[model samples]
Target: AGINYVQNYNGNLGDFTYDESAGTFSMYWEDGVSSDFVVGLGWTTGSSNAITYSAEYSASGSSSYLAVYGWVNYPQAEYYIVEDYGDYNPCSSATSLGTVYSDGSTYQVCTDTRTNEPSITGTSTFTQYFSVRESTRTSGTVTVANHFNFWAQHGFGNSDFNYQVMAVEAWSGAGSASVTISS
Candidate 1:
């Protein structure tokens, strides 16, 4: 299978490498001042595959999150299945709609509306869904279907699949991460 590499960054002080054949990626960022960086591998279209990944992350300053991040069409939405974090919880401000237990952990599910923010279709207002883990870990298997189904059950309507990735996202922080993913 061909690996679909994804990288999005808003800083000048970072580096990343993705090995398509080996299904691995490594990224590092330093002295970030209001910066956000993300990189990973997955399909161009989202799937129900169980993604297994082993990762090591280290960070200092603001925050970093290891997650399955993606976007969708139709209603136009962005979503996250956050497995780990550095300093700050990403869902701290969002109200918890419920909880989901999958992949041997419980995730606090929440949703927020992003008003005219950058998305897959340029600037737009869209719903952002979250499944933030109660406890953080560096590596695990993410059953993507479980989270997707949970969202549908909660009335977050299904949409046309876009890209999905097992990603490490860092913002306003200095960090380094290495990850190898398999499905």
Candidate 2:
């Protein structure tokens, strides 16, 4: 547990460990009872209009999942998850953008239009969430720069990026979540 990760959450959700040696970030939920469940730990980049980043990771969980998300200052204060668990249920209105190939695999892409979600940043509103799918992965490198480019190149123009987060999310049920992202 030596990796440097900053946490942002709305409740006493649970615990996590940052292993510098392994370059992994992991989390655990406290109990079954939940609401507006979100706990994130990752590196934060200041302000940027267009940023490209990549990472290698693997994850496993029950009633929870591993997602790499970005908080942006454009398109209605967007919070974009470039990659997520296959059965992801985001608490918002989402549209399926179909599948696209990247990083040596196929991913089903989707975008979400969200509003009034609780967060440390306050009652929030996110215009769109660009996310792809995954069930479980042993190890792989995720290239999120493309998705942002996908959106921007299409038309949204450039967006200001705030935070880059690798988080484990849980909605309901008593279960645990764990993930390891290597540097």
Candidate 3:
């Protein structure tokens, strides 16, 4: 039942359908499409090797940290986060979970194509090209069960792209579902 698209927005970015029994949530963003090789973004962004927390996805726009409880908080931030109580489905529509645009000199969202990508310091090691999270938020908690199945590909407008695909899975929903730049 898994299909693919070229430039479909699934109604909106971060919009998705959820399966409770299987504990799986799906999202789509046709406009955010980039190179096929996104396996390298794992190292570009960071690792969860020595932490314990659920770092969800940041909002589409805005400049504040969106708490899982659906509250928007201001001030300093590393990575924006989206917390779903695991009780709602986003397939019908997309909701704004607030944004976390931190004005720093080191952290960057690295999404030159995803419209107003996260405001970050241009000093990221992943400064050569564009990157995207191939898989949904997999790391629910802990490093032992946390890994990113992403692709940091490069190229422009075309199905014929040079992509480095990845496959990461996490078995540690031991805590919550949150997002962080610290990892």
Candidate 4:
């Protein structure tokens, strides 16, 4: 079964019209441009990694990007998000665990320790980040559970599945985006 939840965040996610058939969510900020730090949307089937998303967005700003992130609670309460920060280092203050080539791509599996980061759970949560990436992919299918096992042998697996989500973040980018996910 697919476990689902609402999109809860402080960012200006605006109003979204979810198309169930296509498993897609189209979002738009009616009033003005987005001003929040990050715009997060989507659901997580905590039990399984049966979730995948294909997104396409065009944004214009000094710093802006779109990516998929996973939250884990096992080693030190950290999460994995390659495109979390930007097109720079995959993860913030991250360390690479070598390159990972899986499914049909190559990624520099990475890790990071965050002391004070914001989250729906609360602030001041210790976070660890792990990710597989090649570049800022605007569209693709993310294997949520597979990531947990991608580095299982490297003391990086067996994490309590937190959530699998895709976020479109623009430090100040103002435009529109189309996000679609499927099982």
Candidate 5:
């Protein structure tokens, strides 16, 4: 299958390569300041489909995260399923509304409000939902529906889907990741 989308933010000093047919991509970044490199197959609309991924990821610095990232319409929200990280945990400050068990791990469910932040629909205020795993891993299957359902139960409300991707994000750090995603 062909890769549907790739986004690299502030990656001038990094390198990235992808094989469409193989559904794999590799990225390297150094001395990054809020840099995010992502490559994956996606749909115009989102679904509860299970997304499986295998990756070799390593990083050094203040913060970094390897996650399943995406957006939804209506309420216009961004979301993340964080699998692994570097020095900092992204959800450390955010209160965990609940916990979800999926793929043999526990994820603390959380949400935050982003005011006039960058999003798929340009600058706007919206909610950002998160399912941050307690134990980090390099590979696993993300049953996305589990988090979605949990959010709905918690009064987050549902929305029309948008694009989704497996992403590697870094902030003031250095890192490299090679990944293959299966839907």
Candidate 6:
């Protein structure tokens, strides 16, 4: 699963309370423009594609997950979100699989279980360059992106030299988010 966030209001009391169904907080305003209280209460979440826990206990086969290695030790955690970096060239043009996977945020648009999509087990290094698009960002908020570009062959077919993931941590942006697998 992936992390989810929403705006919330703080109660005049010390504790926090909100409608779990609607995500609305218990708040009030003294005036129209001025709020009695304004706050941004956000937290991490998990979804189908991304998760907080480690689920990499088993391995399928080999992989060319070089695209994921490109963005490590970045300033923010967005660089790990590769919208479609592997579309260009994954281990050569012949092995290219074009399916852009951006920060879906708890949801996976392109449902593909890849084998060539590699995972970092130890001290590995890769380099990648990425720029955030305006549409992917939250409206007017301008921020850099994280990318995890790689080749996953075609469809969910089983093949050698491929990597299928059992689970992934909370990452759906153009920044760096480290994941530890029990390889």
Top TM-score hit: 1
How far residue 177's Cα lies from its native spot in candidate 1, in Å, is 0.5
Q: Model 6, stretches more than 4 Å misplaced?
A: 1-47, 50-79, 83-96, 101-120, 124-134, 139-151, 154-183
Error of 5 at 63 (Å): 1.3
- Misplaced by over 4 Å in model 3 are 1-45, 54-112, 116-118, 122-140, 144-146, 151-183
What ranges in model 4 sit over 4 Å off? 1-3, 13-22, 27-50, 60-62, 74-78, 81-87, 91-93, 172-175
Model 5: CA > 4 A from native: 1-3, 11-13, 34-41, 60-62
List lDDT for all candidates, in order.
Answer: 0.79, 0.51, 0.22, 0.54, 0.76, 0.23
lDDT of 1 by residue, 1-183 (tens): 356756555424477788877888888775454656777877788876778888887764648888898887858888889988778775788867889999888999998889998888889998889999887787888888899999987666655888888888886767788888876
Quote the lDDT for 98 in model 4: 71
Q: Arrange candidates by TM-score, highest first: which order?
A: 1, 5, 2, 4, 3, 6
Candidate 4 minimal-lDDT segment of 10 residues: 83-92
lDDT of 5 by residue, 125-159 (tens): 98888888898898988988888888887655556
Q: Residue 33: error of model 6 in Å?
A: 40
How many clashing pairs in candidate 5?
0
- Measured by lDDT, the strongest candidate is 1
For model 4, residues 1-183, the per-residue Cα lDDT tens digits are: 132544435454455555444556555543434455444455553433544566666554324445664555445454544432333454445677776654456667776656667654676645465664665565556655566666675666465666655665454435556776654
Per-residue error (Å), model 4, residue 28: 5.1
Each model's TM-score, in the order given? 0.91, 0.69, 0.20, 0.69, 0.88, 0.18
lDDT of 2 at 150: 58
State each model's C-alpha RMSD to the native: 1.8, 4.8, 18.5, 3.9, 2.1, 17.4
Greater-TM-score candidate between 1 and 6: 1
lDDT of 3: 0.22
Q: Candidates 2 and 6: which is better by TM-score?
A: 2
Better of 2 and 4 by lDDT: 4
